[PDB]
Amino acid sequence: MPGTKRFQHVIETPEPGKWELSGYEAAVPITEKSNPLTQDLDKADAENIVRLLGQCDAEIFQEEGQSTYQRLYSESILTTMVQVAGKVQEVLKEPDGGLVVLSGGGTSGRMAFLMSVSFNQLMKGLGQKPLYTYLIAGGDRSVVASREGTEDSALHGIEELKKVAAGKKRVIVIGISVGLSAPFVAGQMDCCMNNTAVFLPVLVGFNPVSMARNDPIEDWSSTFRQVAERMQKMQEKQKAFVLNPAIGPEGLSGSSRMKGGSATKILLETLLLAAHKTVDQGIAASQRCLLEILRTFERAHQVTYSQSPKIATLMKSVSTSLEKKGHVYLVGWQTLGIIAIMDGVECIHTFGADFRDVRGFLIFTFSQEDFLTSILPSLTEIDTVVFIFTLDDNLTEVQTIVEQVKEKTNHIQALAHSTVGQTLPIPLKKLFPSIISITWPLLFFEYEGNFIQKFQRELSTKWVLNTVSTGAHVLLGKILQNHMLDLRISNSKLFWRALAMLQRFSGQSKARCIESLLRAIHFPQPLSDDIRAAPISCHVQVAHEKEQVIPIALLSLLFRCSITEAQAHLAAAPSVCEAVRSALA
């Protein structure tokens, strides 16, 4: 029948209590899983949430039990990281005609950018021509925009690769898809394997290859799975590499911006920093060199969540300011300002939040007195502002902006990253009673700009912010158990998550779930055969423009009613959360 191909590969819903014995649970990609720790994240109070996420973040460093999937500390992952570092080095020793590209969609692309800058600086501060560049699905404006739909084209990915790789004779392409998912990277990786004489692709994400996305790509003949499998085959002969540790499911199912984003930095910063450090010392990179860095990153998790109680407060605030339809500002300096922006803009697609509910700010790029005029007038008693800076920053520029905002707001708090024995000028101190400071024990730093203290600082911030924004929204009832049900479908991945959530939550058959979801999307049009057989982009295109789609489809299924009857129910409820929740009992 119409729509069998389109949906052949979707796993059928299990009968009740079979979910584990059907073989389904074991088929759920790790990146999409329900993390058992967060089953009741929707009941947790603010301080628990922080524990829970802090604990979810911990899993990055958790070791492989005795049978199971390789992890970040496993010998095979470290051996691959060493080989890849080894291959970076061949390129480092020959900067003329060489290039290194870090490429991904969404937050994977955000990470690629942050990184590529730093390693450009490293080389620059040593007067070397920088060989790093990045690629973000949707071109460079994607870096700081919510643009979920751009990831779904493999040709786009390839065209942007060919742009950036024109003159060159040695290109290393680090393809980054947490889920081993994005058609953007799929194309690049494949392009590479077509031209190894020039190209060396390194796939990075956090599912085993056997869970890699197997869906038809609309402009491409192979799947991510096939590309990823072919890479793995080239790995013996060292012409491609797959770097894919399990780090455990996200605390918020499918939210790869969080642990997936962190692990991406932890993993690549490590390998690259080691690759550099060691060329200059004339030694081959070693499992022992990477391990230094990994353990430092692991310490940083302890250091960061050491401040858990002051993280929870800031959450309790960010949520209360949002509860009262107020706004939240995330002002920060340098690299940290950027992480501030990236997080605010991620709450758009993640939580169907307006660009303003969590806004981020660099000194988006508004310098001192441009932020005093432009933004400072229209704040309020109820808003929250967060300040994020090191004790190495223009702390004069800081105290100035905090001063004005104290009159216009009292719900300020702050994040400051200090080396040990660095002191907090007394004006600032008195402005923040219950401050959050992180002190970094001294480290025997090699290079010019102390990059390892950079990578530390960025990560620690991302953790805090990811945790705040994310838990804030939870406190507000927008999350259902540990799933975000009411997402805007803006690409094919999101479309599949929507459908898997309908199966999980209704527990009805896939065919019924598909029909209700596609009805929900296409309303007022009824299911025709064209619609049933349409490619997934066409559903996306139409859903992307609509509101409450997934909830309305779930309700149609629950009451076993039509869309018309489900809309009219949802309009007659106080809220969406409540309506869905009621219907689920």
Ligand SMILES: CC(C)(O)c1ccnc(-c2cccc3cc([C@H](NS(=O)(=O)C4CC4)c4ccccc4Cl)sc23)c1
């Ligand atoms: C936990 C929950 C809600 O049941 C869930 C949520 C999301 N996805 C699943 C799921 C279960 C079993 C298999 C697959 C496969 C998935 C997807 N593979 S696919 O697009 O080629 C095929 C489904 C259309 C997939 C695989 C890897 C990464 C992302 C995705 Cl969407 S998601 C998923 C389950």
Ligand SMILES: O=P(O)(O)OC[C@@H](O)[C@@H](O)[C@H](O)[C@@H](O)CO
């Ligand atoms: O790196 P992946 O699996 O290819 O995912 C890339 C993007 O879809 C992903 O970054 C998404 O934007 C984030 O909202 C996850 O919360």
